[PDB]
Amino acid sequence: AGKKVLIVYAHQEPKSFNGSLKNVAVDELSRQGCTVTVSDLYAMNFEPRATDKDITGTLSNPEVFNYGVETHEAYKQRSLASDITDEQKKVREADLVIFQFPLYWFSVPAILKGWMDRVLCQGFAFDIPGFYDSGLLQGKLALLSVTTGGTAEMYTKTGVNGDSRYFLWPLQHGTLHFCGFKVLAPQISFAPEIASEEERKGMVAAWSQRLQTIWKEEPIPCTAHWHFGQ
């Protein structure tokens, strides 16, 4: 029961609520004896754009650039940019990948979207065929730890934003499940800006507490029914 964790962290400010959730994750998983690695995207100035700079080798078709085709071939040839293969090594070795981020437009901040776009390339994360339950990262776990501006009540079916699970679909299903991850239940820390100091400390403590038993959890059924109901 020796475990490796990658935290992909997307916040600009170390003193932020996200930074605290990231740090208690590092603290608690470290205390357990886990191997822990953090990719601090903003601190890394992580490149989010999918461009032809991501391939350094002879292009398969230099007249008409197809990012998917060229990165697939570059992965197989090992001519991807090294910032991509650095992240792939971290994912390959991880048993659990935690994404820590504030919700930006019902999704991840663009710098984290770029990580998904560039790191989870064909050949590495998935193949055609070889996706969803046949994805190449099968046997791994993923978990979204998300913070919001909106309260829990705003993110219910009858709330203004609709149920929180609705916006998880592209991330949990379209991305992580597609690559073969099993998905642990999301951690959603609602509206820390609006919360009291007590409620904030409580949300941080609840995450730390959950982490104590994270390795005993079962994943969600990452299906349309789970996300949207009947």
Ligand X SMILES: CN(C)c1ccc2cc3ccc(N(C)C)cc3[nH+]c2c1
x-or-dash pattern for a second copy, window 61-100, by CB under 8 A?
--xxxxxx--------------------------------
Closest CA to 37 of 78, 12, 75, 7: 7
Structure tokens at 99: 């994404």
Residue 155, annotated as binding a ligand? yes
Binding site annotation covers 147?
yes
Given ligand X, Zn ion, ligand FAD, none, residue 128, with its beta carbon under 5 to 8 Å by kind, binds ligand X
Q: Is 72 annotated as a binding residue?
A: no
Instruction: Kindly state whether residue 174 participates in binding ligand X, applying the rule CB under 6 A.
Output: yes
Instruction: Give Cα 63 to chain centroid, integer Å.
Output: 34
Distance, CA of 73 to chain centre: 24
Dihedral sign, CA of 129, 134, 136, 141? positive
Name the binder of 152 from a second copy, Zn ion, ligand X, none, CB < 5-8 A by kind: none
Q: Is the dihedral of CA 122, 66, 111, 85 positive or negative?
A: positive
Is 113 a residue that touches Zn ion (CB under 5 A)?
A: no
Task: Choose one: 88-96, 106-114, 138-146, 214-222; the region binding a second copy (CB under 8 A).
Answer: 106-114
Pair type for strands 35-40 and 141-147: unpaired
148 binds ligand FAD (CB under 6 A): yes
List contacts with Zn ion (CB under 5 A): 123, 127, 173, 177, 222
